[PDB]
Amino acid sequence: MCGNSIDEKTVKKYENQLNQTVKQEIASLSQDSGIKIEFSDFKCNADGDFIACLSPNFKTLAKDNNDEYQELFQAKNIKIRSNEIYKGETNTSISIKEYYNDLFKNQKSIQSNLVFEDFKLGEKVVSDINASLFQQDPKISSFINKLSSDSYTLSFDNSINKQENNYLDNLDIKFYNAKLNFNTNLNINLKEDLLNYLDSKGIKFNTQTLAMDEQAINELLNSDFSNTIQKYIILNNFKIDSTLKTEGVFSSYIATAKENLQTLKAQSQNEEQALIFDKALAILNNITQNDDYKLNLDLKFKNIPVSDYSTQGIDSIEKLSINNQDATEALKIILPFIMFSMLM
Numbered sequence: 636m637c638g639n640s641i642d643e644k645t646v647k648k649y650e651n652q653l654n655q656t657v658k659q660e661i662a663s664l665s666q667d668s669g670i671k672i673e674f675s676d677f678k679c680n681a682d683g684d685f686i687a688c689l690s691p692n693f694k695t696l697a698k699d700n701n702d703e704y705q706e707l708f709q710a711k712n713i714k715i716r717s718n719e720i721y722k723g724e725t726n727t728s729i730s731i732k733e734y735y736n737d738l739f740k741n742q743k744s745i746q747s748n749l750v751f752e753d754f755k756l757g758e759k760v761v762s763d764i765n766a767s768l769f770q771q772d773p774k775i776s777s778f779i780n781k782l783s784s785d786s787y788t789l790s791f792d793n794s795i796n797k798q799e800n801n802y803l804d805n806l807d808i809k810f811y812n813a814k815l816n817f818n819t820n821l822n823i824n825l826k827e828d829l830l831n832y833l834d835s836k837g838i839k840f841n842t843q844t845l846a847m848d849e850q851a852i853n854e855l856l857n858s859d860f861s862n863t864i865q866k867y868i869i870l871n872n873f874k875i876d877s878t879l880k881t882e883g884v885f886s887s888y889i890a891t892a893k894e895n896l897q898t899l900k901a902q903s904q905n906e907e908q909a910l911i912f913d914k915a916l917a918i919l920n921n922i923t924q925n926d927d928y929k930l931n932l933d934l935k936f937k938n939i940p941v942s943d944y945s946t947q948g949i950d951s952i953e954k955l956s957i958n959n960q961d962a963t964e965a966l967k968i969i970l971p972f973i974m975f976s977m978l979m
Contacts, residue, residue: 669698
């Protein structure tokens with residue numbers, strides 16, 4: 636039975652702390668910069684274990700070369716939620732390892748959302764993007780301007796679950812609309828040792844202010860072991876799954892695009908090279924089988940630390956798949972050339 640687990644005093648505390656962090660970050664980003672931000676304090680209310688926060692009428696403005704402000708973007712509201720709520724009033728800096736153990740004892744997974752409701756680009760950033768791609772094909776320019784003007788729901792969601800001596804983190808970004816839907820998902824794996832190691836540097840959660848705190852002396856006691864954190868971060872899967880209702884406007888490029896793949900398929904010197912394109916093709920028809928263009932990517936890395944990525948190489952990866960096509964071997968071909976070409 637779920638309800639009233641968060642007393643109001645606490646909810647107000649988290650709110651004060653959230654409004655305070657952000658306000659600093661506005662003022663830190665902004666000053667002397669010509670980036671300006673409008674932002675109203677959040678209002679927060681308990682939603683079971685989560686706390687739900689809503690800030691309204693938000694927008695970001697960079698600086699006009701002429702001295703006036705240009706709107707980068709806006710949102711009607713921002714909502715935040717998190718169930719990473721430390722309920723106790725104990726007011727005694729606890730060890731970081733305990734901080735998380737306390738959370739995972741009372742809930743299966745700790746979880747957090749930042750959402751931009753009615754996220755809308757600024758008329759200049761659209762102008763930039765229309766002057767950017769100009770095909771001189773009115774419909775596409777109209778389609779592109781319509782799409783770049785249209786307003787969307789942007790979302791960042793993270794979740795962390797305790798499995799065995801391991802932690803399973805799942806980051807997720809979504810950008811969506813009636814006309815398009817772009818969603819990308821990263822799946823880290825994190826070894827319980829990372830937690831032990833952090834505690835080793837005397838990192839403690841201050842139940843008063845709600846931030847992790849470190850001993851000031853550590854400063855005087857500090858080369859660079861941010862690398863060593865890498866030993867306990869394992870990547871699993873990266874993914875892009877998206878769709879666009881094109882209103883049948885690209886139909887012409889996909890046509891000539893196709894021709895080029897077929898023309899370059901003969902130009903292919905070696906079979907390795909042929910398959911690349913056979914694949915590129917496969918993938919393309921599939922994507923653009925109809926005005927609703929669909930892209931379903933899914934990368935898989937074999938489970939090894941991210942510190943060994945220099946040593947194990949491109950074989951850090953294990954498998955790729957785009958729209959139920961397998962493009963592992965083909966990346967494996969292209970990536971080293973790209974990697975070799977691009978590095979010089």
